Amino acid sequence: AKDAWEIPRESLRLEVKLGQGCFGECWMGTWNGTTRVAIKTLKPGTMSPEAFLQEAQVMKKLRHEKLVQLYAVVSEEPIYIVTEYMSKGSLLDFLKGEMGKYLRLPQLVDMAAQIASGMAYVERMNYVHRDLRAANILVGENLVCKVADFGFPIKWTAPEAALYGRFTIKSDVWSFGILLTELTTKGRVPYPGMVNREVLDQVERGYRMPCPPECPESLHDLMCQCWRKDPEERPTFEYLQAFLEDYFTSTEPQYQPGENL
Ligand SMILES: *[C@H](c1c(-c2ccc(Oc3ccccc3)cc2)c2c(N)ncnc2n1CCOC)[C@@H](C#N)C(=O)NC(C)C
Secondary structure (H helix, E strand, O other): OOOOOEOOOOOOEEEEEOOOOOOOEEEEEEEOOOEEEEEEEOOOOOOOHHHHHHHHHHHHHOOOOOEOOOOEEOOOOOOOEEEOOOOOOEHHHHHHOOHHHHOOHHHHHHHHHHHHHHHHHHHHOOOOOOOOOOOOOEEEHHHEEEEOOOOOOOOOOOHHHHHOOOOOOOOHHHHHHHHHHHHOOOOOOOOOOOOHHHHHHHHHHOOOOOOOOOOOHHHHHHHHHHOOOOHHHOOOHHHHHHHHHOHHHHHOOOOOOOOOO
16 A cells, blocks of 8 residues: 555646756646646656655654645655645745845744744654754744754854764754854854864864843853753753744843844
């Protein structure tokens, strides 16, 4: 037999070309002719179904409101995989976007709360991401973020995981902590002035990103404890889901608005 995730090929319609790469093709499209959908294609001369449909299981296992819902699949090559179309694209581009201009701190932390969300659910289902960054975090109507790419970016990576490959969810927090600078300085490269070797050399030797211009020292504290040396005394994604979600009641009920944030 086959699983429920499967459907026919005539119902699908690809209607906009969203990307191009060494990986497959990002397309918008229509399923059943009256449902907006995001599609990614894979090649049958640069990969195999089993080899890349291992990323599908892990997707098909996980189903949460802040991870990009894998609606459906086409298993026999060619292999269209199908997904909720988040409209506003990646978060990095939405923040260097026109919008990211007027975007203020209440939405920069709320989105960041929405993702602390998603990374809690992974965290409870005992998975790691390996890669977490603004360049990965999706977004849709009314700023609805989601994380994605589940199953080199050394600027977002915990030292244990750059050097040894201790990719454990206290690497994905460090990243989240780097993610946390991006929202709060609009997609401006983590670690300004600096390049992948200078990073480590310094990172280790103690150095951590100073609080951004105009950014509350509490969030810098949240940042600076996602970047603690010993992985496991970083905070959990649930602790973080909470701290961010109740931030303006419980933490900063002292902030009036500013010149960027
Ligand atoms: C293309 C893209 C996607 C998108 C769709 C499916 C995947 O598949 C996948 C497989 C395994 C694990 C995680 C994810 C990835 C990305 C997408 C969606 N879903 N909705 C809207 N836009 C989307 N884009 C890009 C922005 O389009 C507005 C991306 C990929 N891969 C991509 O091209 N982004 C970067 C340039 C890499």
